[PDB]
């Protein structure tokens, strides 16, 4: 198992979270697209479909 915060489209502060396990490597290749139907994101400058 692995946990992901939902695709950032909010004007609001973030709440506290407790995480432990991190990958060695960026395995998010299986990701085709974030929140396709929005104009906008929020946090951690991501990419859209390639």
């Amino acid at each position: 198992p692995f946990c992901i915060p939902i695709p950032q489209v909010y004007p609001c502060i973030t709440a506290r979270r407790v995480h432990y396990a991190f990958t060695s490597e960026n395995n998010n290749d299986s990701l085709f697209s974030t929140n396709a139907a929005s104009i906008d994101t929020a946090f951690g400058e991501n990419a859209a479909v390639s």
């Binding site: 939902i6 695709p7 085709f32 929140n35 396709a36 139907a37 929005s38």
Partner: peptide, 11 residues
């Protein structure tokens, strides 16, 4: 399949 795992939460 190009699968829409987490649909878009009402806009």
């Amino acid at each position: 399949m190009l699968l829409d795992n987490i649909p878009s939460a009402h806009l």
